[PDB]
């Protein structure tokens, strides 16, 4: 009990510093301490009850600065603290947590599209590079299932991708998995039960409302019910057995819509609205502040 969905950063006209937390138990939103530096295209995650904001870019009227930053938010104090920075700036990043360690995957630095991957050790406050992906990927969806790390879709600098790959930590090795049925860059990727879900994204022509899931045992991708809204650069998380998608861009509007997927009924429903429309947020779940 007592866990909230935190959304950090994002974009609307410029990169944002907002940290806001939604309580599914009562529908309330809380505005919390702003990020020290505005950022869009970041990712969020939680280790040990602390929220981490990783990478992104500060797009402002006076600049576009890609971020190598790792910042830690403590709900007990409502304060952000800098942690060790990554080896390289990573905008349009994806992240995943394995056994208390944060993996930062891909992303861009200027016109460079990274295949590199690095791993953070909170206990030592250190990053170290691990094996790079087989493909350069920005706008990459990342999730962890059964202590394996998945990198899904994205953009390699020439093509948006339907491909996906998996990292096996004990071998420090990446291997391709079955590709998705749809090209997706800037999708929301998460894990629910024994499947990796890829929701939304951009296929090179349109923002998508379709959603597909990879069953790690059968190695197949299957479509589930589509979202009500097409969206790219959405936030996503799982809470109490349901997927939540937050914001994104539908080709016309920066959405404030938050939708919730119930896997038992295979249905999406609108559950709340963010306080303002935005895309490119980082999202994670931890205890209320
Ligand atoms: C029109 O304004 C917009 C519209 C949507 C999002 C933003 S954003 O400020 O949130 N943002 C812009 C940036 O960093 O350029 C961002 C963040 C994460 C990933 C991605 N991402 N990565 C690759 C692709 C693709 O086109 O294949 C995309 C885009 C999402 C499909 C972009 C600004």
Short mmCIF file of C-alpha atoms and ligand atoms in Angstrom, two decimals:
data_model
loop_
_atom_site.label_atom_id
_atom_site.label_comp_id
_atom_site.label_asym_id
_atom_site.label_seq_id
_atom_site.Cartn_x
_atom_site.Cartn_y
_atom_site.Cartn_z
CA UNK A 1 0.00 0.00 0.00
CA UNK A 2 0.84 3.66 -0.31
CA UNK A 3 2.62 3.61 -3.68
CA UNK A 4 2.33 6.42 -6.24
CA UNK A 5 3.03 6.79 -9.95
CA UNK A 6 5.70 9.49 -10.33
CA UNK A 7 6.16 11.44 -13.57
CA UNK A 8 9.34 13.46 -13.98
CA UNK A 9 10.23 15.95 -16.67
CA UNK A 10 8.79 15.93 -20.15
CA UNK A 11 8.19 18.39 -22.94
CA UNK A 12 5.59 20.97 -23.86
CA UNK A 13 7.06 23.87 -25.89
CA UNK A 14 10.31 23.29 -23.96
CA UNK A 15 11.71 20.67 -21.60
CA UNK A 16 10.02 20.60 -18.21
CA UNK A 17 11.16 20.26 -14.61
CA UNK A 18 7.89 18.96 -13.15
CA UNK A 19 7.80 16.10 -10.67
CA UNK A 20 4.19 15.06 -10.01
CA UNK A 21 2.82 11.92 -8.37
CA UNK A 22 -0.54 10.26 -9.01
CA UNK A 23 -2.32 8.13 -6.41
CA UNK A 24 -4.44 5.41 -8.08
CA UNK A 25 -6.22 4.76 -4.77
CA UNK A 26 -7.85 8.20 -4.64
CA UNK A 27 -7.24 9.92 -8.00
CA UNK A 28 -5.14 12.73 -6.53
CA UNK A 29 -2.06 14.38 -7.98
CA UNK A 30 0.69 16.00 -5.93
CA UNK A 31 3.22 18.51 -7.22
CA UNK A 32 6.64 17.70 -5.72
CA UNK A 33 10.13 19.18 -5.92
CA UNK A 34 11.14 20.27 -9.41
CA UNK A 35 14.08 18.62 -11.11
CA UNK A 36 17.25 20.68 -10.76
CA UNK A 37 17.55 20.80 -14.59
CA UNK A 38 14.56 20.53 -16.98
CA UNK A 39 14.67 17.46 -19.16
CA UNK A 40 12.65 15.61 -21.78
CA UNK A 41 13.47 12.25 -23.30
CA UNK A 42 14.67 10.91 -19.94
CA UNK A 43 13.73 7.70 -18.19
CA UNK A 44 12.75 7.02 -14.60
CA UNK A 45 13.29 4.02 -12.35
CA UNK A 46 13.34 3.13 -8.67
CA UNK A 47 15.93 1.31 -6.58
CA UNK A 48 15.66 0.96 -2.82
CA UNK A 49 12.70 3.30 -2.62
CA UNK A 50 14.60 6.12 -4.32
CA UNK A 51 13.48 7.56 -7.66
CA UNK A 52 16.12 8.10 -10.33
CA UNK A 53 15.93 10.40 -13.35
CA UNK A 54 18.36 9.34 -16.08
CA UNK A 55 19.53 11.13 -19.21
CA UNK A 56 17.34 13.21 -21.47
CA UNK A 57 17.92 16.66 -22.92
CA UNK A 58 17.21 20.20 -21.83
CA UNK A 59 15.56 21.78 -24.88
CA UNK A 60 15.01 25.45 -24.04
CA UNK A 61 14.72 28.67 -26.03
CA UNK A 62 18.49 29.12 -25.67
CA UNK A 63 19.80 25.60 -26.14
CA UNK A 64 19.58 21.85 -26.61
CA UNK A 65 21.86 20.16 -24.07
CA UNK A 66 21.88 16.36 -23.99
CA UNK A 67 22.10 14.99 -20.47
CA UNK A 68 24.53 12.53 -18.94
CA UNK A 69 22.94 13.14 -15.55
CA UNK A 70 21.68 10.71 -12.95
CA UNK A 71 19.65 12.44 -10.22
CA UNK A 72 18.07 10.81 -7.18
CA UNK A 73 14.81 11.88 -5.52
CA UNK A 74 14.11 10.79 -1.94
CA UNK A 75 10.37 10.78 -1.17
CA UNK A 76 11.14 10.98 2.55
CA UNK A 77 12.76 14.41 2.11
CA UNK A 78 11.17 15.70 -1.12
CA UNK A 79 14.68 16.50 -2.32
CA UNK A 80 16.72 15.77 -5.43
CA UNK A 81 20.43 14.97 -5.16
CA UNK A 82 22.94 14.53 -8.00
CA UNK A 83 24.51 11.11 -8.41
CA UNK A 84 27.43 10.09 -10.58
CA UNK A 85 27.01 11.02 -14.23
CA UNK A 86 27.07 8.51 -17.06
CA UNK A 87 29.97 8.16 -19.48
CA UNK A 88 28.08 9.97 -22.24
CA UNK A 89 24.97 12.13 -22.76
CA UNK A 90 21.90 10.02 -23.61
CA UNK A 91 18.74 11.72 -24.86
CA UNK A 92 15.78 9.52 -25.82
CA UNK A 93 17.13 6.89 -23.43
CA UNK A 94 15.70 3.71 -22.01
CA UNK A 95 16.54 2.20 -18.64
CA UNK A 96 15.97 -1.00 -16.73
CA UNK A 97 16.83 -2.32 -13.27
CA UNK A 98 18.33 -5.75 -12.58
CA UNK A 99 19.14 -6.79 -9.02
CA UNK A 100 19.51 -3.26 -7.72
CA UNK A 101 21.52 -1.98 -10.69
CA UNK A 102 20.41 0.58 -13.27
CA UNK A 103 21.14 -0.10 -16.94
CA UNK A 104 21.19 2.95 -19.23
CA UNK A 105 20.63 1.90 -22.84
CA UNK A 106 21.21 3.69 -26.11
CA UNK A 107 20.01 7.21 -26.73
CA UNK A 108 21.50 10.09 -28.66
CA UNK A 109 24.20 12.71 -28.28
CA UNK A 110 23.81 15.24 -31.05
CA UNK A 111 23.77 13.27 -34.29
CA UNK A 112 25.38 10.22 -32.61
CA UNK A 113 23.05 7.22 -32.09
CA UNK A 114 24.42 5.05 -29.29
CA UNK A 115 24.64 1.31 -29.13
CA UNK A 116 26.52 1.63 -25.84
CA UNK A 117 25.08 0.48 -22.51
CA UNK A 118 26.27 1.22 -18.97
CA UNK A 119 25.37 -0.06 -15.51
CA UNK A 120 25.07 1.95 -12.28
CA UNK A 121 25.88 0.58 -8.82
CA UNK A 122 24.00 2.68 -6.21
CA UNK A 123 26.08 1.32 -3.33
CA UNK A 124 29.33 2.56 -4.91
CA UNK A 125 27.82 5.51 -6.84
CA UNK A 126 29.63 4.35 -9.98
CA UNK A 127 28.78 3.68 -13.61
CA UNK A 128 30.62 1.19 -15.79
CA UNK A 129 30.14 0.33 -19.45
CA UNK A 130 28.94 -3.15 -20.36
CA UNK A 131 28.62 -4.81 -23.76
CA UNK A 132 26.97 -2.58 -26.39
CA UNK A 133 23.79 -3.57 -28.17
CA UNK A 134 23.94 -5.17 -31.61
CA UNK A 135 22.05 -2.14 -32.98
CA UNK A 136 22.28 1.60 -32.39
CA UNK A 137 18.96 2.64 -30.83
CA UNK A 138 17.48 5.98 -29.74
CA UNK A 139 13.89 6.24 -28.59
CA UNK A 140 14.46 2.69 -27.36
CA UNK A 141 12.04 0.89 -25.08
CA UNK A 142 13.64 -1.05 -22.24
CA UNK A 143 12.29 -3.49 -19.71
CA UNK A 144 13.47 -6.30 -17.45
CA UNK A 145 11.85 -9.72 -17.11
CA UNK A 146 13.34 -12.66 -15.22
CA UNK A 147 16.64 -10.77 -14.71
CA UNK A 148 17.14 -10.30 -18.46
CA UNK A 149 17.23 -6.84 -20.08
CA UNK A 150 15.33 -6.13 -23.29
CA UNK A 151 15.87 -3.30 -25.78
CA UNK A 152 12.90 -2.85 -28.10
CA UNK A 153 12.50 -0.81 -31.28
CA UNK A 154 13.81 2.72 -31.59
CA UNK A 155 15.64 4.56 -34.35
CA UNK A 156 19.17 3.85 -35.60
CA UNK A 157 19.64 7.17 -37.41
CA UNK A 158 18.28 5.92 -40.74
CA UNK A 159 15.33 3.63 -40.00
CA UNK A 160 12.81 3.23 -37.25
CA UNK A 161 13.00 -0.33 -36.01
CA UNK A 162 10.80 -3.33 -35.35
CA UNK A 163 13.81 -5.30 -34.06
CA UNK A 164 14.51 -6.15 -30.43
CA UNK A 165 17.33 -7.74 -28.47
CA UNK A 166 18.04 -9.19 -25.04
CA UNK A 167 21.02 -8.84 -22.70
CA UNK A 168 22.16 -11.84 -20.66
CA UNK A 169 24.18 -10.37 -17.76
CA UNK A 170 26.14 -13.49 -16.80
CA UNK A 171 27.52 -13.62 -20.36
CA UNK A 172 27.70 -9.84 -20.91
CA UNK A 173 26.14 -10.53 -24.30
CA UNK A 174 23.26 -9.28 -26.43
CA UNK A 175 21.20 -11.49 -28.74
CA UNK A 176 18.43 -10.63 -31.16
CA UNK A 177 14.92 -11.76 -30.29
CA UNK A 178 11.91 -12.10 -32.58
CA UNK A 179 11.12 -8.67 -34.07
CA UNK A 180 7.86 -6.96 -33.29
CA UNK A 181 5.06 -6.96 -35.82
CA UNK A 182 5.18 -3.15 -35.94
CA UNK A 183 7.98 -0.63 -36.32
CA UNK A 184 8.00 1.41 -33.11
CA UNK A 185 10.24 4.28 -32.06
CA UNK A 186 9.45 6.18 -28.88
CA UNK A 187 7.08 3.50 -27.65
CA UNK A 188 6.31 2.70 -24.03
CA UNK A 189 7.81 -0.65 -23.03
CA UNK A 190 7.14 -2.47 -19.77
CA UNK A 191 6.75 -5.95 -18.28
CA UNK A 192 3.55 -7.49 -17.01
CA UNK A 193 3.36 -11.13 -15.96
CA UNK A 194 5.54 -13.09 -18.44
CA UNK A 195 5.37 -10.64 -21.34
CA UNK A 196 7.16 -7.55 -22.60
CA UNK A 197 4.57 -5.01 -23.80
CA UNK A 198 5.28 -2.37 -26.46
CA UNK A 199 2.58 0.32 -26.56
CA UNK A 200 2.34 3.13 -29.07
CA UNK A 201 5.33 4.79 -30.65
CA UNK A 202 5.97 6.16 -34.12
CA UNK A 203 6.32 3.84 -37.12
CA UNK A 204 7.83 6.39 -39.51
CA UNK A 205 4.43 7.62 -40.75
CA UNK A 206 2.04 7.85 -37.78
CA UNK A 207 1.86 7.75 -34.02
CA UNK A 208 0.41 4.40 -33.00
CA UNK A 209 -2.38 3.26 -30.69
CA UNK A 210 -1.58 -0.42 -31.17
CA UNK A 211 -0.06 -2.53 -28.41
CA UNK A 212 1.74 -5.86 -28.71
CA UNK A 213 3.34 -8.21 -26.22
CA UNK A 214 6.25 -10.64 -26.39
CA UNK A 215 5.82 -13.90 -24.50
CA UNK A 216 9.35 -14.83 -23.45
CA UNK A 217 8.52 -18.55 -23.44
CA UNK A 218 6.92 -18.78 -26.90
CA UNK A 219 9.07 -16.01 -28.46
CA UNK A 220 6.05 -14.56 -30.28
CA UNK A 221 4.57 -11.08 -30.40
CA UNK A 222 0.78 -10.80 -30.19
CA UNK A 223 -1.40 -7.70 -30.44
CA UNK A 224 -3.67 -6.86 -27.51
CA UNK A 225 -6.42 -4.22 -27.37
CA UNK A 226 -5.25 -0.85 -28.73
CA UNK A 227 -5.09 2.25 -26.58
CA UNK A 228 -7.83 4.86 -26.97
CA UNK A 229 -5.21 7.40 -28.08
CA UNK A 230 -2.38 7.19 -30.54
CA UNK A 231 0.78 8.26 -28.75
CA UNK A 232 4.53 8.52 -29.17
CA UNK A 233 7.00 9.48 -26.42
CA UNK A 234 4.60 8.21 -23.75
CA UNK A 235 5.44 7.35 -20.19
CA UNK A 236 4.58 3.85 -19.00
CA UNK A 237 4.64 1.83 -15.80
CA UNK A 238 2.98 -1.12 -14.13
CA UNK A 239 1.12 -0.93 -10.83
CA UNK A 240 -0.98 -3.60 -9.12
CA UNK A 241 -1.17 -5.75 -12.22
CA UNK A 242 -2.18 -3.04 -14.69
CA UNK A 243 -0.29 -0.94 -17.22
CA UNK A 244 -0.53 2.84 -17.05
CA UNK A 245 0.40 5.03 -20.02
CA UNK A 246 0.92 8.75 -19.45
CA UNK A 247 0.87 11.57 -21.97
CA UNK A 248 2.73 11.51 -25.25
CA UNK A 249 2.12 13.13 -28.62
CA UNK A 250 -0.73 12.08 -30.91
CA UNK A 251 0.30 14.09 -33.97
CA UNK A 252 -1.87 17.08 -32.97
CA UNK A 253 -1.73 17.51 -29.20
CA UNK A 254 0.61 16.86 -26.30
CA UNK A 255 -1.72 14.59 -24.38
CA UNK A 256 -2.73 14.86 -20.75
CA UNK A 257 -4.55 11.49 -20.96
CA UNK A 258 -3.57 8.62 -18.67
CA UNK A 259 -4.94 5.22 -19.74
CA UNK A 260 -4.91 1.96 -17.78
CA UNK A 261 -4.79 -1.54 -19.28
CA UNK A 262 -6.48 -4.46 -17.52
CA UNK A 263 -4.96 -7.71 -18.88
CA UNK A 264 -7.77 -9.90 -17.53
CA UNK A 265 -10.42 -8.08 -19.58
CA UNK A 266 -8.04 -6.93 -22.36
CA UNK A 267 -9.42 -3.39 -22.12
CA UNK A 268 -8.04 0.11 -21.73
CA UNK A 269 -9.81 2.81 -19.74
CA UNK A 270 -9.12 6.49 -19.11
CA UNK A 271 -8.26 6.86 -15.43
CA UNK A 272 -7.02 10.42 -14.90
CA UNK A 273 -5.49 13.39 -16.65
CA UNK A 274 -2.10 14.86 -15.92
CA UNK A 275 -2.17 18.47 -14.79
CA UNK A 276 -0.97 19.50 -18.27
CA UNK A 277 -0.26 17.74 -21.54
CA UNK A 278 3.32 16.64 -22.12
CA UNK A 279 5.49 14.04 -23.82
CA UNK A 280 8.87 12.48 -23.13
CA UNK A 281 8.43 11.93 -19.39
CA UNK A 282 10.18 9.49 -17.11
CA UNK A 283 7.89 7.38 -14.92
CA UNK A 284 8.29 5.01 -11.98
CA UNK A 285 6.48 3.79 -8.88
CA UNK A 286 7.54 4.16 -5.25
CA UNK A 287 6.21 5.11 -1.84
CA UNK A 288 4.34 8.35 -1.23
CA UNK A 289 6.50 11.27 0.02
C1 LIG B 1 6.66 17.38 -31.87
O1 LIG B 1 7.33 17.49 -30.60
C2 LIG B 1 7.54 16.31 -29.89
C3 LIG B 1 6.80 15.20 -30.23
C4 LIG B 1 7.03 14.01 -29.52
C5 LIG B 1 7.97 13.99 -28.51
C6 LIG B 1 8.70 15.12 -28.13
S1 LIG B 1 9.93 15.03 -26.85
O2 LIG B 1 10.37 16.38 -26.53
O3 LIG B 1 9.34 14.40 -25.73
N1 LIG B 1 11.14 14.16 -27.64
C7 LIG B 1 11.87 14.95 -28.77
C8 LIG B 1 13.30 14.70 -29.01
O4 LIG B 1 14.07 14.37 -28.12
O5 LIG B 1 13.61 14.86 -30.26
C9 LIG B 1 11.35 12.71 -27.58
C10 LIG B 1 11.38 12.02 -26.37
C11 LIG B 1 11.54 10.62 -26.35
C12 LIG B 1 11.69 9.89 -27.54
C13 LIG B 1 11.64 10.54 -28.75
N2 LIG B 1 11.85 9.86 -30.03
N3 LIG B 1 13.05 9.20 -30.30
C14 LIG B 1 12.98 8.78 -31.60
C15 LIG B 1 11.71 9.22 -32.19
C16 LIG B 1 11.30 8.97 -33.59
O6 LIG B 1 10.79 9.94 -34.23
O7 LIG B 1 11.52 7.88 -34.17
C17 LIG B 1 11.09 9.96 -31.19
C18 LIG B 1 9.80 10.53 -31.09
C19 LIG B 1 8.79 10.25 -29.91
C20 LIG B 1 8.52 9.62 -31.31
C21 LIG B 1 11.49 11.95 -28.74
C22 LIG B 1 8.48 16.29 -28.87
#
